[PDB]
Amino acid sequence: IFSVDKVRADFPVLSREVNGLPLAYLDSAASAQKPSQVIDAEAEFYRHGYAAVHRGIHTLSAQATEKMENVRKRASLFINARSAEELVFVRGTTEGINLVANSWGNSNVRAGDNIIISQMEHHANIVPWQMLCARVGAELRVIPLNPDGTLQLETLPTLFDEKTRLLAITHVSNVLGTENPLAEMITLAHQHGAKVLVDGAQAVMHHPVDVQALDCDFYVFSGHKLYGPTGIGILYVKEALLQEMPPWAGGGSMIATVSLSEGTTWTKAPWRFEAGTPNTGGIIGLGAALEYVSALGLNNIAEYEQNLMHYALSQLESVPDLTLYGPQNRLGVIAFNLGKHHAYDVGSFLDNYGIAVRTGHHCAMPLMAYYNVPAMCRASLAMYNTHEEVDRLVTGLQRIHRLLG
Amino acid sequence: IFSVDKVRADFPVLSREVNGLPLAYLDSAASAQKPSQVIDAEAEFYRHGYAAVHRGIHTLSAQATEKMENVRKRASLFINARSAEELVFVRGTTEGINLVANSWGNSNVRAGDNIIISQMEHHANIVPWQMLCARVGAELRVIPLNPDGTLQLETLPTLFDEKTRLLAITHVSNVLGTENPLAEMITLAHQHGAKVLVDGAQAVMHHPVDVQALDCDFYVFSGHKLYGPTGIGILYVKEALLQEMPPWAGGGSMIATVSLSEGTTWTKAPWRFEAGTPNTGGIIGLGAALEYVSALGLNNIAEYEQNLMHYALSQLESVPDLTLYGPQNRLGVIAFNLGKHHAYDVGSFLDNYGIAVRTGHHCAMPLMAYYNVPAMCRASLAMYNTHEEVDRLVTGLQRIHRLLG
Ligand SMILES: *Cc1c(COP(=O)(O)O)cnc(C)c1O
Ligand SMILES: *Cc1c(COP(=O)(O)O)cnc(C)c1O
C-alpha cells in the first residue's frame, strides 16, 4: 500500500495558504508540485558540483558531465528504452514534438503524403504537423471523437493508406483523461510503414510506460509534470531512426567542427539535437524526480490515484447540473461545466475557497469545438491529493450552484 | 570599493575541494558559479510559489505569472531597454541567435544579399548565419583579425555594401577578451540600412550595458554566465523590428487559436516566441542573479576585475615560454599556450593542482585557425577570484614548465 500523509509531507507547497484558506492544489495536469528531494537535489548541485559540461577538462566539469549522462541512463530505464543514446534532452514536450517534425518530418514526408492526428490532441501535437503539411504539400487527417471522449476507431480504414507517413497520437488526454489503445494503433500504423509519435506528457506519472512493448517510434514527455523542474523534457527515438535524422537548430555539442571555408559538421546521435549549454540544473532535478517516483512505485501511485478518482466521481454525482466530459475510466483529470455558468466564473469561485483548478480551453480548442463549448473546468487528482480535497471541491460546486443558480 | 572576501562568502562552491586541494575556479567564462541568493530564490519559488503560468485562473498561477513578468521588467532595466516587451526569454544565447536567423533572417535576407560576421565569433554566432546564407542564396562575409586579436577595421569598406542586410558581431570575445567598438560599427551598419545583432554573452557581467546608447537591433546573452541558473537567456529586440517578426517554432502561449478547418493564429510580441511552458524556475533565478549583480554594482565589479587582470598579466611575465593571445586591454579571460606542450596536458596538470581552466577550441575554431594552433588554455578572472588564485596559476605554469620542459 501507499500513504498519502507520508507523501504529502514531502511537498512543502501543500502547507501553503491561498486567500487565507488552506490550498487544495487540483491543477497538477497543468504542472505538478515538486517534492523536497527534487528541489534540494538541484540546489545541492548548484552549491557543491556546478560547472560547464562541454566535455571539459577539469574535475568539476568532468563530474558534471557524468551526472548528466547518468540521468539520461536513469530516464532510459524509466521508460524501458534499449539504450540511453535513444533519449534526447529537450526543453519540454512542445519542443520535442517540433524537433521531430523538423528533423524527421522534412526528410520523410513529401507532397501528396498524409499525416494522422486525433481530435483530442493538445496544440503541441497539432501545430507542428499543420506546418509540416504546409511546407511539403501533405495532408493532415484527423481521427474524430465519440461523445464519451474516446476515439472513433472505426474511421481508421478511411484515414490510413499507402501514403500515410506518421501517426501522432496522445497517450492520455490532458482534458478528458482518455487513455488511447496505443499498442494496437501502432500495429496498424506499422502495417503501412507509417511511424508513430506518442505524446506521453500526461502518462508517465500515472503508471509504468514501456516503449519497447509499445513499439512506438517517438515518445515525448515533460519534466515539470513529472514532479520535476521546469525547462526540461525527454524525447525518445528508436536508435535506427535517430541515427538517420539530419540536423536543424545548431549550437554547441550539436556543432562538431566549423570552418569559414569548408562549412560545419555535426556530432553523432543524442547529442546532435542538444545545442548550446544543456539545462544541467533541470537535468539534475529530473533525475531526482525520477528516483522519487520510482521509490514510491508507479503501480502504488496508479492504485491510489485510481481509487481517489472513483471516490471523486461517486461524490460528484450529488452535484446538480454538473456536466462531465470524457469516459468512466479517466486517468488523472476531471473535465466539467456547472449548469450554464461560464467556466471562468466557476473557477474564480473555487479559487476563492482556496481550490486551484484550470479553466479555459486547456490548449485543446478542437476538442472544445467538438463538444460545442468555449471552455471547461478541469480538476487534476494526483498522488498527493486527498478525499478531503475532493469533498471541498464537491461542496464548493454545490455552493456555487446555490448562489449563482 | 568592493570586498572580494564578502563576495566569495556568498558562493558555497568556492569552499569545495578538488583532488584534495582547495579549488581555484578559473572557468567562469564557460559558466559562472552562483551565489546563495540566486540558488535559494529558485528553491523558495519551488517550495512556496510554484504553479503553471499559462495566464491561469487560480491564485498561485496568477502570482507566478506576475513573478515572471517582473523579471522581464527587471532585465529590461538592466540593459536599459525602452520597454519590457522588447525582451524575449530564450533557452540561451545559442537559441536566441538562431531565433533571429529563422524569424527575421528568412524574411529579410534574399538571394544575392550578404551578411557580415567577424573571425573571432563563437560558433553560436557563425553556424546560424552559414545556414541562413545557404537557404536563401546569400553570401557570408568575414571581418578578419589582427595578430593582437582585434578586428581589422580597415577592411569594412570592402565588406559593407548596399546588399548587406545584417552585421552579427561579438561584444566581448569569449577567448581573447577583446571588446569590439560596437557603437561605431553600428553607425556604419545603419548607414547602409543593415541591422546589427550583438552577441553579448561575455559582456553583461563585466560592466554596464546600455542597448539604447549602442542602438543595436538585437542583443542576446546567457543566464548561466551571469551568475544565474542554467536553461535561460535573454534576447533583446527593437520594438519596431520585434512586432514585425513572423512565427517559427510554435507551442503554448506562442499559439493563440488553433482550428482543424481554419488553421492557427499566434499571439502578439514577446510572448509569440516563447513556446510551451516557460522555464519559470530559471526565470526566477535569473531575476535574483540580476538583483545580486546590481546590488554589487557593475562599476565596482569592473574595477576589481580590471585590477585582478592587470595583476595577473604582470605576474605572468615571469612564466617562461608563455604565449598569450589577444590585446593588452582584455576583459575577463586570458588565453595562452605553454611552450610546445599540448593545451590538453597543461590543463590536466593545473586541474591536478585544483585549478580549473578551459582547454580546447573554445567553440571558436576559425579563431584557432587564425593563430595556427589547434587549441589554447583559457583562464577566467571573475569577480570572486583573488590574487592568491592568480599566484597559484603562475606557480603552476612554472612547475609544469620545469617538469615537462
Ligand atoms: C502540457 C502538455 C503538453 C505541453 O508540454 P510542455 O511541457 O508545456 O511543453 C503537450 N501535450 C500534452 C498532452 C500535455 O499535457
Ligand atoms: C558561451 C557563449 C555563447 C553560447 O551561449 P549558451 O548560453 O551556451 O547557449 C555564445 N557566444 C558567446 C560569446 C559565449 O561566451
Place of cell 553570401: B139
Beta-carbon contacts of A368 under 8 Å, excluding residues fewer than 6 positions away, are A361, A362, A374, A375, A376
B364 CB under 6 A from ligand 2? Answer: no
Contact B275 A126 (CB under 8 A): no
C-alpha distances in Å from residue B84, one per residue of B87, B89, B91? 6, 11, 18
The shortest CB-CB distance from A276 to any of B42, B124, B264 is to B124
For residue A33, which of A224, A203, A293 has the smallest C-alpha distance?
A224
Residue A298: name the closest of A384, A179, A207 by CA.
A207
Residue with the smallest CA separation from ligand 1 atom 12 is A201
What b/e readout covers B362-388, taking b as 16+ CB neighbours within 10 angstroms?
A: bbbbbbbebbebebbbbbbbbbbbbee
Look up residue A203 and give its amino acid.
A
Following DSSP, what letter does each residue of A50-83 receive, concatenated?
Answer: ----SS-SSHHHHHHHHHHHHHHHHHHHHHT-S-
Gap from CA of B46 to ligand 2 centroid (Å): 27
CATH number of A37-296: 3.40.640.10
Euclidean distance between CA atoms B18 and B23, whole angstroms: 6
Look at the block and give the residue holding cell 583579425.
Answer: B145
Give the start-end residues of each E strand in A223-373. 233-237, 255-259, 263-266, 322-325, 333-338, 355-356, 358-360
Residue from B253, B277, B279, B280 to probe ligand 1 pocket by mutation (most atoms less than 8 Å from CB): B277
The closest CB to that of A230, out of B49, B128, B280, belongs to B280
Query: Which has the closest alpha carbon to A122: A224, A60, A198, A212?
Result: A198
Cell of B293: 549583480
The Cα-based distances of A171 to A77, A178, A197, A198, A216 in angstroms read 19, 8, 10, 6, 11
Amino acid at B236: Y
DSSP A191-227: HTT-EEEEE-TTTTTTS---HHHHT-SEEEEETTTTT
**What is the spatial distance between Cα A295 and Cα A309, in angstroms, rounded to a whole number?**
22
Question: CA B366 to CA B143: how far, in whole Å?
Answer: 12
Three-state helix/strand/coil letters over A23-41: CEECCCCCCCCCCHHHHHH
Which of B91, B93, B119 to mutate to test ligand 2, by most ligand atoms within 8 A of the CB atom? B93
Amino acid at B369: A
CB neighbours of residue A328 within 10 Å = 10
Between CA A279 and CA A286 the distance in angstroms is 11
Read off the C-alpha cell for B116: 557580415
Helix axes A280-296, B280-296, angle to 10 degrees: 140
User: B323: Cβ–Cβ under 8 A, 6 or more apart, which residues?
Assistant: B336, B337, B338
Tell me, what DSSP letter sits at residue A341? Answer: S
Report in angstroms the alpha-carbon separations of B188 from A174, A177, B157, B164, B219. Answer: 53, 59, 10, 11, 17
Q: Answer yes or no: are the C-beta atoms of B293 and B302 closer than 8 Å.
A: no
Alpha-carbon distance A318 to nearest alpha carbon in chain B (angstroms)? 24
Best of B19, B273, B277 to mutate (most A CBs within 10 Å, chain A): B277
**Contact state of A277 with B222 under an 8 Å Cβ cutoff:** yes
Which amino acid belongs to residue A73? K
- Note the resolution in Å, 1 decimal: 2.6
What whole-number distance in Å separates Cα of residue B123 and Cα of residue B365? 8
Of all protein residues, whose CA lies closest to atom 2 belonging to ligand 2? B201
Cα B47 to the chain's mean position, in Å?
30
Q: In terms of CA atoms, which chain B residue is nearest residue A141?
A: B260
User: Which residue's CA is the closest to the ligand 2 atom numbered 12?
Assistant: B201
- Angle CA B194–B199–B204, to nearest 5: 130
Domain boundaries, chain A: 2-36+297-400, 37-296
**A398 CA to middle of ligand 2, Å?**
55
Buried b (16+ CB within 10 A) or exposed e, B195-209: bbbbbbbbbbbbbbb
* Cβ neighbours of B370 in A, within 8 Å: none
Residue A222 Cβ inside 6 Å of ligand 1? The answer reads yes
- The shares of helix, strand and coil residues in chain B, as percent rounded to the nearest 5, are 45, 20, 40
- Whether the Cβ atoms of residue B94 and residue A251 lie closer than 8 Å to each other: yes
CA of A333 to the centre of ligand 1 (A): 14
Determine if ligand 2 sits within 6 Å of the CB of residue B200. Answer: no
Q: Which residues of chain B are within 8 Å of residue A139 when distances are taken between CB atoms?
A: none
Catalytically active residues of B, by annotation: 363
